[PDB]
Structure formats: C-alpha cells, structure tokens
Design a protein around this ligand. Structure first.
Ligand SMILES: O=C1Cc2cc(Nc3ncnc(Cl)c3Cl)ccc2N1
Ligand SMILES: O=C1Cc2cc(Nc3ncnc(Cl)c3Cl)ccc2N1
Ligand SMILES: [Cl-]
Ligand SMILES: [Cl-]
Lengths: 124, 4, 124, 4
C-alpha cells in the first residue's frame, strides 16, 4: 500500500494498556499463582503468551474469570513476566533468572526464554 | 511519521 | 531500574491484537457508523482515542456492547482510523484526507490530526 | 534485547 506509519504508535498503545491495568480498568481475568492474584486483560495475555493464547481461544476457558496456574509456578517470576507483557521491560536478575526462565517456558514466551538461556550461558 |  | 528491553515487543503485541480483531476473538463492542458496523476491543479503542477513553471510563457506557457515532462521521474515515489503531499504518489519500481528519478530530487522535493538517498545508 |  501507500500508507504512512507513526513510529511511536505501538509503544503508546502498550503504555495506555499498562495505565488501564494499573487502574484496574476493563481487566477481565484474575490469574491465580498459589497465594497470589494478578488482574489483567485476556487480550494482552494472549498477545504475549502461547499458553494464554491457547487458553482463551478454548470455547469453555474463554469465559472463565479466574485461571489457576500450575503450583510449581513462582508468583514473583509471574509478576516480572506480567510487567514485561505490558511494558517490553524485563527485570532479569541473578536472584530471579531461574524462576523467570521456568515461568517463560510454561507461559510459552520464546523471546524471554531465549534471553534467559543466553544470560545463564554467559555466567557458566 | 515515516514511509514504512 | 536495571531492566532489559525487547525492542519489537510493542509492535508484536499490536500485530497479535490485530490478528484477534480479524478473527473476531474477544471483541467486546460494535461501533455503529451510520449503516456500517465495526467490531473492536474496548481497551485498544481507549488506548488510541481520547473519545473512546472518555466513553469507556464512564460508569454506564463502559457496559454498553453497541456505541453509535455522530451521523456526520464517515464510515470509510472511521475504517481507516480503526485500521491505524491496530497497525500504526494510516492510509491517507487525497480522496479521503478531509474525512480522515474530521474523524480523527472527533475521535481525539491528535497525532493523526497533526499529520492531516501538515499534508493539507503542503497542497495549499 | 537492549539496555533502554
Ligand atoms: O512466544 C510466543 C508469544 C506468543 C503469542 C501468541 N499470540 C498469538 N499468536 C498468533 N495469533 C494471535 Cl491472534 C495471537 Cl494473540 C501465540 C504464541 C506465542 N508464542
Ligand atoms: O490523541 C490521543 C490518544 C489518546 C488516548 C487516550 N488514552 C489513555 N490516556 C491515558 N490513560 C489511559 Cl489509561 C488511556 Cl487508555 C487518551 C487521550 C488520547 N488522545
Ligand atoms: Cl516473549
Ligand atoms: Cl493518534
């Protein structure tokens, strides 16, 4: 086509989606990770995660307001990944890298799994 | 704005 | 913080949100523009438009499944702007610029209004 | 991935 493109549009959209999440506006699901609960937008979770994409395209699970993750999932690792979904920024540290990588593998977030593998390989 |  | 950032994350999220729109997945509103209907995600419309942000933060309108726009709004201009919201690409042409600018002013999409004003000024 |  002959379209023009606004370079900062995708980033501005994601910033506003994160502002809606922070104010709990139009959040339609709560993700339960052991004793912890995280409110989010199903569309953003699907757009970021192969696992959530599979869950919310399922004809019965698409209607659930609560999703319980596997008990082996670490709440902090999930929190870090949820923040990444809404911001593009990943808080990867020596103390959380193993939990973040395991959570990213479970959530099917291949670019996160990739950077965790590379950061671990460099420390070996 | 740019030409993509 | 000491976060790392994935450059293509925001663009990848928006691409997936557009794929969900194309397959009518988790769309929660229909925008009526005279004889034409457009399905969308309320969160994306709010993230892109000052008008939709005001509508869907309203305690009664947040629950509506149908929103009717002002009869002066051109369906093609709306279609072009809805495509821009989900892609960052604006199909701006001599034949649609006036309708696109008027629709962007109504929707409160200031960056679109700005490029339309500049393109019009150059042709004068 | 970059340092933002
Ligand atoms: O590493 C990742 C990140 C990811 C996201 C999604 N999401 C979608 N993919 C295709 N169309 C649609 Cl409509 C969505 Cl929402 C699926 C798989 C994966 N894997
Ligand atoms: O030109 C524009 C584009 C736009 C979007 C929105 N959206 C939001 N703004 C602040 N926080 C939130 Cl939570 C959202 Cl969703 C409001 C005004 C405008 N004006
Ligand atoms: Cl990823
Ligand atoms: Cl805009």
């Amino acid at each position: 086509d002959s379209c023009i493109q606004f370079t900062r549009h995708a980033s501005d959209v994601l910033l506003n989606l994160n502002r809606l999440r922070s104010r709990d506006i139009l959040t339609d699901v709560v993700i339960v990770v052991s004793r912890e609960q995280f409110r989010a937008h199903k569309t953003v979770l699907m757009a970021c995660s192969g696992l959530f994409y599979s869950i919310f395209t399922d004809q019965l699970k698409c209607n659930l307001s609560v999703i319980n993750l596997d008990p082996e999932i670490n709440p902090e690792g999930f929190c870090i990944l949820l923040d990444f979904m809404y911001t593009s920024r990943l808080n990867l540290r020596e103390g959380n890298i193993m939990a973040v990588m395991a959570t990213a593998m479970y959530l099917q977030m291949e670019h996160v799994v990739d950077t965790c593998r590379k950061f671990i390989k460099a420390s070996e | 704005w740019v030409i993509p």
